[PDB]
């Protein structure tokens, strides 16, 4: 039917895998096993359309990408709200996306994850400002509670549809 190729990128430990696994498998991964490159598939109905999501869960750790990202149609750019450095490095991921796609207009959503945690160093307004400069939505999530998880991924699908 209708297939959407989604790619999740961002710094090591920000919760890329936990987000993807919550969406697809409906549980929270508490442990931290660094990812190399994993993929997930699932059929879902989004706004009345039956569709297939193909989700690529990428590595954040420099040790553990460009080739995999090439076929991506939309990207979640993830940072954690308790990790200022992960936010500051979002530009690096966007730059990589623009290179692999050879376009300055690629569907993306900015995601501030771990919103259940109280040691916040990135305020919502700061992230909204970054997103606005890129012309994309900002959404906060918790892979732990499931807050915003479906919204983040489904919003990305709706961004691809505007492309
Ligand atoms: N409290 C809380 N912990 C979270 C959340 N998301 C992820 N974590 C925790 O953060 C750690 C790293 O999560 P993980 O999903 O493995 O991160 P990653 O971005 O995929 N890492 P990598 O880039 O190395 O593959 C895990 O211990 C996980 O339980 C969240 O929303 N809230
Ligand atoms: Ca668990
Ligand atoms: Ca290129
Ligand atoms: Mg991972």
UniProtKB/Swiss-Prot annotation:
Asked if Ubl conjugation is a keyword of the record, the answer is yes
Upon changing residue 34 to G, the result is: No effect on interaction with PLCE1
Annotated keywords: Acetylation, Cell membrane, Cytoplasm, Disease variant, Glycoprotein, Golgi apparatus, GTP-binding, Hydrolase, Isopeptide bond, Lipoprotein, Membrane, Methylation, Nucleotide-binding, Nucleus, Palmitate, Prenylation, Proto-oncogene, S-nitrosylation, Ubl conjugation
Q: In which tissues is it expressed?
A: Widely expressed.
The entry summarizes how activity is regulated as: Alternates between an inactive form bound to GDP and an active form bound to GTP. Activated by a guanine nucleotide-exchange factor (GEF) and inactivated by a GTPase-activating protein (GAP).
**Does Flavoprotein appear among the keywords?**
no
Recorded catalytic reaction(s): these are: GTP + H2O = GDP + phosphate + H(+)
**Broadest EC class assigned to this enzyme:** hydrolase
Q: Which residues carry this modification: S-nitrosocysteine?
A: 115
Mutation effect (residue 61 to R): Promotes interaction with SHOC2 and PP1C
Q: Membrane topology for this entry?
A: Lipid-anchor
According to the record, mutating residue 32 to F results in:
Loss of interaction and recruitment to plasma membrane of PLCE1
**Predominant location of this chain?**
membrane
Subunit: In its GTP-bound form interacts with PLCE1. Interacts with TBC1D10C. Interacts with RGL3. Interacts with HSPD1. Found in a complex with at least BRAF, HRAS, MAP2K1, MAPK3 and RGS14. Interacts (active GTP-bound form) with RGS14 (via RBD 1 domain). Forms a signaling complex with RASGRP1 and DGKZ. Interacts with RASSF5. Interacts with PDE6D. Interacts with IKZF3. Interacts with RACK1. Interacts with PIK3CG; the interaction is required for membrane recruitment and beta-gamma G protein dimer-dependent activation of the PI3K gamma complex PIK3CG:PIK3R6. Interacts with RAPGEF2.
Q: What name has this protein been given in UniProt?
A: GTPase HRas
**What is the originating organism of this protein?**
Homo sapiens
